Amino acid sequence: IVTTILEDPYVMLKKNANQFEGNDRYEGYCVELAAEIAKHVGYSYRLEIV
């Protein structure tokens, strides 16, 4: 599980968040950073706001 906070270009909810499920409900910088490390280390994750 990933803990994060919403602030500007790091993490912000995606356009039409009503029609979204899971990790495809967020977009930003830290979103892409979370994606890169999860692959290199090797574990699936789930994003959650504080």
Partner: protein, 41 residues
């Protein structure tokens, strides 16, 4: 594995490309003689 992965991203240049995208690529902004405009009148 995370600490070393961070160093793996930085040295190769993953962060630097990613920082260029969200700031600039996804952005909405962007001789000292007598000029012609001063005399134009």
């Amino acid at each position: 594995p995370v600490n070393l992965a961070v160093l793996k991203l930085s040295e190769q240049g993953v962060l630097d490309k990613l920082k260029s995208k969200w700031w600039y690529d996804k952005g909405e902004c962007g001789t000292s003689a007598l000029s012609l405009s001063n005399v134009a009148g």
